[PDB]
Design a protein around this ligand. Sequence first.
Ligand code: BCL
Ligand SMILES: CC[C@H]1c2cc3[nH]c4c(c3C)C(=O)[C@H](C(=O)OC)c4c3nc(cc4[nH]c(cc(n2)[C@@H]1C)c(C(C)=O)c4C)[C@@H](C)[C@@H]3CCC(=O)OC/C=C(/C)CCC[C@H](C)CCC[C@H](C)CCCC(C)C
Ligand SMILES: CC[C@H]1c2cc3[nH]c4c(c3C)C(=O)[C@H](C(=O)OC)c4c3nc(cc4[nH]c(cc(n2)[C@@H]1C)c(C(C)=O)c4C)[C@@H](C)[C@@H]3CCC(=O)OC/C=C(/C)CCC[C@H](C)CCC[C@H](C)CCCC(C)C
Ligand SMILES: COC(C)(C)C/C=C/C(C)=C/C=C/C(C)=C/C=C/C(C)=C/C=C\C=C(C)\C=C\C=C(C)\C=C\C=C(C)\C=C\CC(C)(C)OC
Ligand code: HEC
Ligand SMILES: [Fe+3]
Ligand SMILES: [Mg+2]
Lengths: 278, 46, 46, 274, 47, 333, 318, 46
Amino acid sequence: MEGTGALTDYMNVAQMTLYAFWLFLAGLIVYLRMEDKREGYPLQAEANENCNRTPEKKLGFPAPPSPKVFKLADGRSIQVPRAEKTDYELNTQLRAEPTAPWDGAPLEPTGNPMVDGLGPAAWAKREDEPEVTHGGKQKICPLRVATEFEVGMSRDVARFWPEIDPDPRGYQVLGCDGKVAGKIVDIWVDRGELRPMYLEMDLSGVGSSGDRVLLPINFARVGYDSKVRVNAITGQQFTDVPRLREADRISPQEEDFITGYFGGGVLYAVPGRTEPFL
Amino acid sequence: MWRMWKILDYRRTVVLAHVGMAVLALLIHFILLSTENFNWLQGNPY
Amino acid sequence: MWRMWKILDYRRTVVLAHVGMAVLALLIHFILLSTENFNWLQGNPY
Amino acid sequence: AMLDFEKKYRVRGGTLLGGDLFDFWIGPFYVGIFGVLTAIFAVLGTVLIIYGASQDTFNLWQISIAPPDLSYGLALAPMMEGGLWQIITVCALGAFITWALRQAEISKKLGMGYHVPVAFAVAILAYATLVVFRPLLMGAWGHGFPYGILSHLDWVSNVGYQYLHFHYNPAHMLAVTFFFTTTLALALHGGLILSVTNPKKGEPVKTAEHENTFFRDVIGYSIGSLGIHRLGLFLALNAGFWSAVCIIISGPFWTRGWPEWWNWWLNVPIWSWG
Amino acid sequence: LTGLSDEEAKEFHSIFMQSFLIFTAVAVVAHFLAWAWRPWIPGAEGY
Amino acid sequence: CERPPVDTEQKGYRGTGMEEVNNPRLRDDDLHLAPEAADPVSAEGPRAGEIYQNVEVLDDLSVAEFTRLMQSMTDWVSPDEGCTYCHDGNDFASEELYTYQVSRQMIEMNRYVNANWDSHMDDTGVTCYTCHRGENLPEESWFAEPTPDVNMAGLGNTMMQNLASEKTEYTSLPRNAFERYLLGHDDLRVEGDTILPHLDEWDVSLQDTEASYSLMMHMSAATGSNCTTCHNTGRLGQWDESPEEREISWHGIRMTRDINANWIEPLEAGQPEVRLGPTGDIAKVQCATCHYGEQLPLDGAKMVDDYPGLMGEEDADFDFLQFGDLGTDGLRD
Amino acid sequence: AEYQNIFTRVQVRGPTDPGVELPAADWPRTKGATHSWLLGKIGDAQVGPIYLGTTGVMSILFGIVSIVIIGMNMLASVDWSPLEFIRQFFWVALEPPPPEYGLSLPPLNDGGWWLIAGFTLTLSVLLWFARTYNRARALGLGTHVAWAFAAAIFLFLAIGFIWPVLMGSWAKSVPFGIFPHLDWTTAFSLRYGNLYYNPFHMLSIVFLFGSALLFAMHGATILAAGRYNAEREIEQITDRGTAAERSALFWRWTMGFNATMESIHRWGYWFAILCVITGGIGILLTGTVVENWYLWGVHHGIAPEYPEFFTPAVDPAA
Amino acid sequence: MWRLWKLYDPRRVLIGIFSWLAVLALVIHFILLSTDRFNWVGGAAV
Ligand code: BCL
Ligand SMILES: CC[C@H]1c2cc3[nH]c4c(c3C)C(=O)[C@H](C(=O)OC)c4c3nc(cc4[nH]c(cc(n2)[C@@H]1C)c(C(C)=O)c4C)[C@@H](C)[C@@H]3CCC(=O)OC/C=C(/C)CCC[C@H](C)CCC[C@H](C)CCCC(C)C
Ligand SMILES: CC[C@H]1c2cc3[nH]c4c(c3C)C(=O)[C@H](C(=O)OC)c4c3nc(cc4[nH]c(cc(n2)[C@@H]1C)c(C(C)=O)c4C)[C@@H](C)[C@@H]3CCC(=O)OC/C=C(/C)CCC[C@H](C)CCC[C@H](C)CCCC(C)C
Ligand SMILES: COC(C)(C)C/C=C/C(C)=C/C=C/C(C)=C/C=C/C(C)=C/C=C\C=C(C)\C=C\C=C(C)\C=C\C=C(C)\C=C\CC(C)(C)OC
Ligand code: HEC
Ligand SMILES: [Fe+3]
Ligand SMILES: [Mg+2]
């Protein structure tokens, strides 16, 4: 093999350039893998997983990097992984019992998994202070306090063809079994993404007309018949949806509480959802 | 027929008319250039 | 006309002129270089 | 070992089949019934591939499990004349289908939608187009691509040149556009998230208002944090879908040179000009 | 409606039409020079 | 759009992707039907060279065989005109019509390629019907690309490319491939024979690659083939990785070049202006002129063994390597 | 029957957003911003405003000149016929200089217009890189988007400028046309022996296919976890919610390993730019240090060998 | 026509007018370059 690019009897420039990239790619994969381990590491190796019968921390390969510091706009510095989120996860006592004593066995919830926070009903530990926008306004807020927002992107579409630009205020909320839980009384909007995040609804169908509860927009099927259908939970289960600490504000922790509860209905809303087809 | 401006937005209609007539005027002048008998710059016999 | 600067922003107009003339000066010099009669580096007979 | 927040999620249920019998984890992997099936299919296919390597060559690039001849039609071939390829093909289809079904069980157990298994089904559809649908329409399993790192590149080359210029394939043009657009969208989305959460050193982490402002400043439109993930999935899935279309119409629905397909455009009465 | 008043709009229009007129006057001379160099309207026999 | 069923034939090893896919509904089934040969005419008596006056090519035929060839040639190139297409009135021995002078050259060419180009046509040969198919002009000829003078300071110079043309099979590839390789003898090879570059030994441009690509597009569609029938496109320049059709088509390029340069072009001066092309040239032979989209012209019907007189003598100076490949002895001026 | 998070059902329209305020040295944004119902179904409905700065305006001017030069040469190539321009729209191009001119300046109608169009287009993308760079800095963001764009420019400059200069001729560069530049792409592979055998072309495809794979995975994961507000990825990075946990757990339980909400964007970022970086490098290698990629593949033992199926052709001129 | 400047921002009109003039003049000069008769840098005889 002769000609330009030859390095030896067998090696050439295009071959060595390729091995230079293999070295760079291997280093990059190590870097990317280390970036993957900034949340959830080191791994908690529970007692049943080891012959020594004692909980251990596992790093894995590559080992997790040094903690990352995020500067926040309000004037705080948060170190990732967060101490209090890990501390909460390794201190809470789950209301669930593993089906078998060996490691890898699934947990069987003891109480009500939807309110206890198991599996799809689980919530993360988040800050209890409601988020704010860059300007300084409340980030997620109902339309009553955020009067600059109107429902419907186009007035003409919402007026003449309201089916494809709906205004779900005043609609009825139906559970997964058709139970009429209540009626939407407000829409919560995110001032940062300009989207409806939740549908506030009274519990008149299953509780009082003055009890307010939040239905996440991604758990709600807003139909063309002035109905909102919630396949996640039963109409009666709306009564246990977590309530807001303040009637006009919602915190990141509260958002996880509410979305966790509705997500719990994927497996636990009705008997048989947790069972296989055959 | 001055009532047309109660229906069509005059400010947008005027801008769209100029852009639209710009495209058309270029289009027609270009069509004439492509022809043998009306390419004035080429000056073919008529 | 001095009143042009109460309609057009002088700060932006100066920048637009400079970047605008940069494009035009580069284009014209390149066109002349891409001709036989005016490529001063090639030095073809005139 | 488990992630420090993983414990509260490892619950029972959400399976499609198998139920409590296979509902457990081995290390980080969820098993399920389809995990046993996908492991059986994967090992069986890989070991059969390695056996096919043993009969030809162990060079990693030169290993090739070739489909049977077109003369065999849709019949199952002898093992060393394309039958091994046919067995591995059904194993690979079984492995891929059980993989997506396993993701459905994991999606249900976590309360997530079935977007990931459905998006992967588009990839399975493209693969099934290559080895089942197109071979079926043309009438022989030999039209499938060989199972080899370098041999299947020669298959793509020759099949593309069977139509003398595969760049002129209209569905291929659309599919490539989606492929190029999705990596442009990925670079933009990946960069934008990193730019916000890793700003110039010293500055605080920016908000979603900065994200919208940045792309409206650059190109005048911002699709939003929800729109970009819809757009990314849309572009990637259309890239997968139109890839299947471009290859399915190459031979069953078009036997001539792909540039000749554009003769309809050249004969439109509006702009014939002759 | 823009901020400009009737006096402001009338003053802009007067200067605009003058400025447009001077622009067209220069182009008219440029076309006279171009015509003196090589005319662009062929006869029946072409050029 | 097309639809199944489609006819498939494997051209390479299984899994290489080398196959031919054909649509049976596209075949004309009549353009490729060879005419029924005339009955075997008795060969006896004096030769047509002495009985007839102005006979130069068909001297060794008998009178009965001469008449049989004339009737067959009439039904091959001009069945709707008859004898008066090449012969004026009651003066059959008059060489005045241009079609007569062209057809005399055509007979010599037909005899020449039938005898010397077995490296491409093997035992099939050709016939007046092979190109003409019962028409005065073959429907698959080509004219040289116009060479419009350029401004060199203007705009829009298409350097023989960037226009959808039927010559390039509706690509933007160079439209002058026929002139370069089927009338000229430009090198078709684009790939280097070495692993590493030798720019002073092999620096073929991408314009020449597209010109070669343009000719290959024609060679595929003109014969009903594709890249795979003559190539393993994964290893394109390897002859041992290519089917024998590549070797046969190699001689087809040189045979087509031989026909145009030596037999067709010398007929340009006598051709009428109505027959000439935009540049002023005579219509030239391409691959489709004999194949008409089929790998075997006229379904491979060997109908030149029934017609002695269309077979010449094997030229002793024929090499098939003297048409631009290491030599230009077989090409004219 | 569940909300699939494919189209936004309920929309809310506030006042049009002027944007985050810039330092008092940037040009004012445009004052035209509207809301589109159709674009609100997919994502953010607001169209505009757009920033026009020094580099932004200059990039448009260079880009317009490039497009005018290309368009006028295309229109002149079809004899100024708009009808033939539409008919030949995919086939027309601005052709590069022929090989005889090498790297010198060719006449206008013999590749000169191509070189001017290529020069101004290069200037416009370079200025657009600076425009993207400055917009990120003006808002106090990282310059990841600009450097991802710079990686794209590298392939753009490698294909069209760097590699032709290394080859010593502008003729090897790519014409400004739709089907003609596809012809260049194919002729490139034909000329240098099946670019499938270029290892960096293989790698560039790995990251191209891996980018579509990653965005399919990530886009579906975020949409599947949209019930838990996963699309709010900044909040999920600084304050890990259950959406980030479920997304990470979904892939960990599937394939044994997982990223974070922040780290998946690093994976997608690097896959996108490696596709274009390796592609540029592979284009630089061919013709310069490798003549025939198939013969190079045979030399390194990667080309498969097939058993006999036909009678091999023999070169008559060999 | 003086009311036209109350309708549209005069700054935006001038930018639109000037941008059109620059584009159109660039196109017209290029058309002349394409012709043999009016290509001044080509130095073509009549
Ligand atoms: C027969 C054809 C050959 C082939 C010949 C080539 C050639 C030649 C090249 C590739 C290249 C690539 N090939 Mg290939 N390729 C083949 C078969 C394939 C197959 C397949 C399944 O068969 C696939 C998936 C690919 C995929 C790829 C990519 C990995 C790579 C292109 C990356 C890219 O995104 O560029 C697209 C992105 C850019 C070009 C950068 C864009 C950025 C710039 C700045 C955009 C500016 C926009 C501008 C301002 C817009 C206005 C301009 C005016 C309007 C004019 N090839 C076969 C073997 N391929 C490229 C490569 O990287 O090689 C290694 C390349 O040069
Ligand atoms: C359709 C849009 C894009 C897409 C989407 C997509 N891919 C996906 C998903 C999605 C949404 C997943 O959820 C799933 C996943 O889990 O990814 C991590 C996956 C996935 N996409 C993968 C690969 C992949 N995707 C590709 C493409 C694409 N994927 C598209 C561009 C390609 C290409 C273009 O080549 C590849 C190689 C895997 C990493 C993973 C699914 C893995 C899987 O099912 O593994 C099962 C277990 C095995 C070990 C497989 C064994 C199979 C056989 C028994 C043996 C091998 C047979 C095979 C035919 C050999 C072929 C070899 C030669 C071709 C060299
Ligand atoms: C990681 C590699 C991938 C990638 C990445 C990438 N591309 C990028 C970026 C990134 C990260 C940007 O930030 C940048 C961008 O702006 O993205 C939105 C861009 C970009 N990638 C683009 C294209 C592009 N990217 C491609 C590919 C890829 N991009 C890769 C797959 C391709 C392909 C496949 O060929 C193309 C064509 C652009 C859309 C943009 C860069 C924009 C640019 O350079 O702008 C200047 C260039 C010009 C030609 C100027 C045009 C000017 C207009 C014609 C003016 C119009 C007239 C008038 C002003 C309008 C108003 C009319 C009046 C009448 C009112
Ligand atoms: C008539 O038309 C009007 C005016 C009405 C408007 C219409 C415009 C139209 C229709 C435009 C159409 C444009 C199209 C279809 C363009 C297609 C473009 C494509 C597909 C391009 C694809 C690839 C092209 C590439 C990659 C080109 C790369 C070229 C490069 C990188 C050139 C670099 C050149 C340089 C840097 C020059 C340097 C000059 C120096 C000084 C260095 O030389 C000495
Ligand atoms: C292909 C290789 C051919 C064979 C074999 C024969 N002919 Fe031909 N012929 C061929 C071409 C390409 C042309 C030119 C077509 C055009 O458009 O100009 C011709 C022309 C003639 C003509 C003249 C027709 C005319 O101008 O009116 C005649 C009379 C003719 N050919 C007769 C002819 C005969 C008798 C043949 C058999 C012996 C014959 N041709 C063979 C291509 C080919
Ligand atoms: Fe994301
Ligand atoms: Mg070309």
